[PDB]
């Protein structure tokens, strides 16, 4: 790797600079280099890793959706050649490459070394998320297996989070939010999505009384996203 000669602490420092400059591809490359040093990541470092790759894949997903919509309109009327499909495929392949990179970091060896609930749930949620992004573009004989891989990662994360974290924990809430999106948008299970969002919101509501002002703000921000989805879905 091109980051093999840079100090771990320097990679982290530069990832933070890249974030300030909105240079998310650089940020992701720095954080990949930091992961590959082989040490476990702190809470701050895990969040840097997620912010970096979420922004990279977010731009790719937005572009893929634009190109996929153009391609769909083209197949309704004048023939324009292979260019739309070719370019959609180019963006899709780069998206899949980023997802494979993230999944590879989780598999070598972030998940297997993560013993505390906060780290393990965070990484398993990420695994579900990046399989979900792969599922968004999957169309062939592997769509079912990709969907099953996302479901399995989310389910393992859910089981740990329910046993080890309070219902207001932001990681637990964000996991439940994303698993509900998986059910609605990927798994053709809107009723499961709605039930999960409702139960998650209500259990968090009942635990808010235990929280400080700052933790209350952290939890209610995610709870509002669950409510926004319920409003969209019902």
């Amino acid at each position: 790797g091109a980051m093999g000669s840079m100090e771990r602490a320097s990679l982290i420092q530069k990832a933070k600079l890249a974030e300030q400059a909105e240079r998310y591809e650089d940020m992701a490359a720095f954080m990949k280099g930091a992961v590959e040093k082989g040490e476990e990541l702190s809470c701050e470092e895990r969040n840097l890793l997620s912010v970096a790759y979420k922004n990279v894949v977010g731009g790719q997903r937005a572009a893929w959706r634009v190109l996929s919509s153009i391609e769909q309109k083209s197949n309704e009327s004048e023939e324009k050649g292979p260019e739309v499909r070719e370019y959609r495929e180019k963006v899709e392949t780069e998206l899949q490459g980023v997802c494979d990179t993230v999944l590879g970091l989780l598999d070598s060896h972030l998940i297997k070394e993560a013993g505390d609930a906060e780290s393990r749930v965070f990484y398993l949620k990420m695994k579900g998320d990046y399989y979900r992004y792969l599922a968004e573009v999957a169309t062939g004989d592997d769509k079912k297996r990709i969907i099953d891989s996302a479901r399995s990662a989310y389910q393992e994360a859910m089981d740990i989070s329910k046993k080890e974290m309070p219902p207001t924990n932001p990681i637990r809430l964000g996991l439940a939010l994303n698993f509900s999106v998986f059910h609605y948008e990927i798994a053709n299970s809107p009723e499961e999505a709605i039930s999960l969002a409702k139960t998650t919101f209500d259990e968090a509501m009942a635990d808010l009384h235990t929280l400080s002002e700052d933790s209350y703000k952290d939890s209610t921000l995610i709870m509002q996203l669950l409510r926004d989805n319920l409003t969209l879905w019902t």
């Binding site: 949620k125 998320d129 809430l173 509900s180 948008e185 996203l225 969209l232």
Partner: peptide, 10 residues
């Protein structure tokens, strides 16, 4: 499209 989680989670 539904909302998914922010990348930063406390």
């Amino acid at each position: 499209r539904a909302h998914s989680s922010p990348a930063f989670l406390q």
